[PDB]
Assembly symmetry: C3
C-alpha cells in the first residue's frame, strides 16, 4: 500500500504474509532416562547411579500418575620381618591401588550422570513438568528431525524464513503419554502442523491518528486489517489466525468487501477517504510503534527534551515520525517517552579450587 496515505492519517502498523495450516502431522519422542552405561565397571558406578535413579523417580512419579488419571478418562628370625612386612605393604598398596580407581571412576560417572539430568530437564522441561500440551524446545524438535532440519521443515511446509515465526506461533506442541517407572522410560507425543503458504497475498495492518486537515476532528475510516492479492483488497477477519510477527497462521480466510470509497483511498487515492469524529476528548493524538512514536505534532506539543526543540510539522506532513535519530527524549503533554537507551552486561563464573593437606 505504501505511505502516501500517511498524509491522510492512515499509518501502516504492519504487513504480514498469510498461510493455511493443519495440525495433522505427528510424531513421538521416546526418552531413555537412565543413560547407557559401560559393561561391568559398575560396582563403583552403583553409588551415584542409585542417587540419580532415585531423584529420577522422585521427579517423574507425579507426572506419571497424572498421565494415568487423564488417560483413564636374630638375622634368620628378623629376616622373616622383611619377608612379611614387604609382602604386606605390597598387598596394602595394591588395595589402595585399586581403591583409588573406584573413586576415580565413580567421580566421573556421577558428574556425567548429573550433567544428563539437567540436560534432560532443560530439553524436555515443559513435558516433564505438565500433562497437557506444551511448546517444544528448539532442542526437542531438532532431535526429532534427527539433526536434519532441512528435511523436517520441508515436510512441515515452511522454509527457513519461517522457522522462528513457526516456533513462536506455538503450533508445534507435545505432551507426556507414557512413563515406565521401572525401565525409566518417557514417552512424549509431538504434534506438528502442515502449513500451506498462500501466495502473493499479504495482510496489512492499519491504524489512524486524529488528523486535522478537514479539522482536528478528523479521523479517517478504514478497517483494522486488510488483505489483498493483486487489485482485490478486502477486510480480513483475523479471528481465525495465530499471528506471529512475520507470518499469519490461519485455519481459514473469512473476509469482507468494503465501501468503494475505502478501496479507492487505501489504494493510492487520498480524497476517497472519509474522516469523522467518534474519538473522545481523552484520546491521545499520537501512538507508539516499533520503539517509536507517531504523533500529530500539530494537535499537541512535540517537545524534544534531549535535542532541545519543538518538533513541529508543516502542512502536508499530517503526522510526524519522531524516532531515535530525529529526537532522543520525547514529551507529549503529560508523559515522557525515552526513545533510546542501552545496557550491557556479562554473566560468568570463576571457580575456586581449595587445595588440601
Amino acid at each position: 500500500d505504501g505511505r502516501p496515505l500517511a498524509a491522510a492519517g492512515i499509518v501502516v502498523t504492519g504487513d504480514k504474509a498469510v498461510n493455511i495450516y493443519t495440525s495433522s502431522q505427528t510424531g513421538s519422542i521416546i526418552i531413555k532416562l537412565l543413560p547407557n552405561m559401560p559393561k561391568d565397571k559398575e560396582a563403583c558406578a552403583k553409588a551415584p547411579l542409585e542417587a540419580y535413579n532415585r531423584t529420577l523417580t522422585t521427579l517423574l512419579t507425579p507426572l506419571g500418575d497424572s498421565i494415568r488419571r487423564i488417560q483413564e478418562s636374630g638375622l634368620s628370625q628378623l629376616a622373616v620381618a622383611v619377608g612379611k612386612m614387604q609382602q604386606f605393604v605390597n598387598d596394602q598398596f595394591n588395595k589402595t591401588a585399586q581403591e583409588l580407581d573406584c573413586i576415580k571412576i565413580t567421580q566421573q560417572v556421577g558428574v556425567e550422570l548429573n550433567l544428563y539430568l539437567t540436560e534432560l530437564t532443560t530439553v524436555f522441561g515443559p513435558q516433564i513438568t505438565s500433562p497437557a500440551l506444551t511448546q517444544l524446545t528448539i532442542q526437542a524438535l531438532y532431535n526429532l528431525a534427527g539433526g536434519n532440519m532441512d528435511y523436517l521443515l520441508t515436510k512441515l511446509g515452511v522454509g527457513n524464513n519461517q522457522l522462528s515465526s513457526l516456533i513462536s506461533s506455538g503450533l508445534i506442541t507435545g505432551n507426556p503419554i507414557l512413563y515406565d517407572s521401572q525401565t525409566q522410560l518417557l514417552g512424549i507425543q509431538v504434534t506438528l502442523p502442515s502449513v500451506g503458504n498462500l501466495n502473493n497475498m499479504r495482510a496489512t495492518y492499519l491504524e489512524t491518528l486524529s488528523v486535522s486537515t478537514t479539522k482536528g476532528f478528523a479521523s479517517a475510516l478504514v478497517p483494522k486489517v486488510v488483505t489483498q492479492v493483486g487489485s482485490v483488497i478486502e477486510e480480513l477477519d483475523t479471528s481465525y489466525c495465530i499471528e506471529t510477527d512475520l507470518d499469519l497462521y490461519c485455519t481459514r480466510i473469512v473476509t469482507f468487501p468494503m465501501s468503494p470509497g475505502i478501496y479507492s483511498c487505501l489504494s493510492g487515492n487520498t480524497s476517497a477517504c472519509m474522516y469523522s469524529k467518534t474519538e473522545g476528548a481523552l484520546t491521545t493524538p499520537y501512538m507508539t510503534l516499533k520503539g517509536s512514536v507517531i504523533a500529530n505534532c500539530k494537535m499537541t506539543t512535540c517537545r524534544c527534551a534531549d535535542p532541545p526543540g519543538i518538533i513541529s510539522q508543516n502542512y502536508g506532513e499530517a503526522v510526524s515520525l519522531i524516532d531515535r535519530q530525529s529526537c532522543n527524549i520525547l514529551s507529549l503533554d503529560g508523559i515522557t517517552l525515552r526513545l533510546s537507551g542501552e545496557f550491557d552486561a556479562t554473566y560468568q563464573k570463576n571457580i575456586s579450587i581449595q587445595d588440601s593437606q
Copy 2:
C-alpha cells in the same frame, strides 16, 4: 446438536462442558533449599555444601530482592629399623585409610547435593524465576496435595476427567513471597480455584462454509458459540471464560436469545436456516479442523495427489470432509496440505568412562 445441519453448511467445530469457578482456595508451599544433612559426617561434606549453598544465594538473591520491592508496595641396631619402619607404614596407611573415606563420602554428598538443585529448579522453576503469578508444575501441585491427589481435586470440585483441563486452564498458580537467605528457605504461595461444574449444560462452537444451496452465494447465519440446557438454546458470551480444550472455565454465564428461525435451524430443522452473502471474493471455501480439512469440494477442485482422484460430492452432502484415511495429500486449488505424517526419535545418552593407574 448432531450433524444434519452439516448439510445446511453449519459445521460444528467443537463441544465443551461449562463450570463456574472462583480463585478462592489458597495454599503455601515452604521449600527447604539446604538438604537435611546427617549429623557429624560434615568435615568431608563442608566442601561441596559450600559451593552449592553459594550458587543457591547467587540464584535466589535477585528473586529475593524483588519480592521485597513488590511487597513494600647391627642385628640389635638394625632391628630398630623394623620397629620404626613397621609402626610407620601402619600409621601412614591408616592416614591413607580414612583419607580415602572422606574422598568417598564427599564424592557422594556432592552428587546428591547437585541432583537436588536441578530437581528443585525443575519443580519450582517458574517461581524461582519470577515474582509474579506463574503456572504450577505438576510436581508442585502433587507435593502440595501431599501425594494424595484424589483428596485435593475433591476439594477443588473437579474429578480426574478435568485434571488435564484444569492444568491447561492456568487457573492454578503460585508466586514467591518469602526467601530467608540465611536459613535458605523459600516461600511459595499457591492459589487454587473452586470450580463448580454446571450440569447438563454444554457450549457448542459453530462455524460455516459458503454453501451453495440457495446459490453458491449462500452462507448460513448462526452464532459462533451456543450453550444449551435441554430445549433451551441461546448464544453464549464466551468473553467471560478461560477456554480449555475439554472444558470452559467461566466466571459468569452471559447469554442472549436468538431468532426463532435460528433456534429452529440449529435444533434439527434445516429450512428455518437463513443464509446470505457477506463473504468476499478472497474468502476460502475450505476451513481446517483438528488435522482434517472440511471443504465445499463443489466450490473448488479437491484433487488428492496421494491416492489420486478428485474427492467429489454431490447434492444433499453440502461439504466434503477430507480426512487422513480418505486422502493423504489434499490440493484445494493453490495450496497443497499434508493430512498425514509421522516422525519418531529417541533421546538417550551413552556415558563413556576413562581408566587410570
Copy 3:
C-alpha cells in the same frame, strides 16, 4: 467511581492505572558458558571439564543452528632390604599422596562445574531453549541492570510499585543472536520498554448483574471499561493495551464519548441509568470475582452451607458480596462454591550417605 451505583446493578470489577510505552530501549547480555578456571591446576580438572564442555555443545548446537537459519533471511645383605623397602614405601606413599589430591580437586571442579550448568539453564532457560523472543527471567534483568535495580526502573519509567506489573506485562523480552561454539559464548539481546505513566488517568472496569428494580428483566447499560481524567469520563478501547493486574500498558489511548445519560449514571446518579433486557434465559444472576462472588441474592436463593443462613440483600442493596468472612461455602441454586479453604506442605530432601571401608 465508588459504589452507590452498586444499588443500580453496576458492579466495579476493577480499577487500574494507565501508561504509554514504547519498546525503544535495548540491551545485550553476553554469557560465558565455560567458567573462568584457575591457572595450571587443570591436569585434574580436565576430566570433568571435558564432560561439561561436551554436554554444552550437545545442548547449544541446535539453538546455534536455528539462529543462523533465521539470520540468513646376612646383616649387611638384608640391611639392604630395609634400604630399598624403606625408600620404596616413601616414593609409593608419595604417589598415593598427590594421587589423593587430583581426586580431591576434580571432586570439587566437578560439582562447581555441575552447578553452573543448572544455574545457567535456570537463568537463561527461555533464551537457551528458543530463537524467538522470550520472557526474561528475573535473574537476567537483575544481572543486566548490574544488581542496580533502582537505576534500571528509573531509566525504564516505572517505580517499584510497577515491577511486578512490568514483569507480568511480558514487555521485557530477550532472544539469542549468537553462539560461538568454539569459545562457548552465548549472545542474548534484551529489549526493555520505556513506559511513560500517564497521570491521574484511571481505567475502571465495569460489569452488571440482572437487577430487578424495574423488574427481574433489568440490566443497566454501561461500557465495560471507562477511563476518566477529572470530570471527563469516556469509554476506553483497551484493544491497544497489555493488561496487567495493577497496570494497563497501552500503545495508544483510543476512546469514545457516551450518552449524557450514561455519564450522569456512572458519575454518582442512579436514575439516569438505562436498563433493558437483552439477557437470555440461561444467564446466571451472579458472578465470580477475586475469590468471592457478587450475586443478586433476590433473584436466586443465596444459602451459606457452612455458617448456615440465607444471605439476603435489601431494597437499595441490589446485589451482595459474600466474602470468606461472610461465608465459607456459598450455594447459588445449582452450584456450591468453596469461598474458602487452604493447603500447606513442605518440599525438602534428606541426604543419606553410604559408608565405605
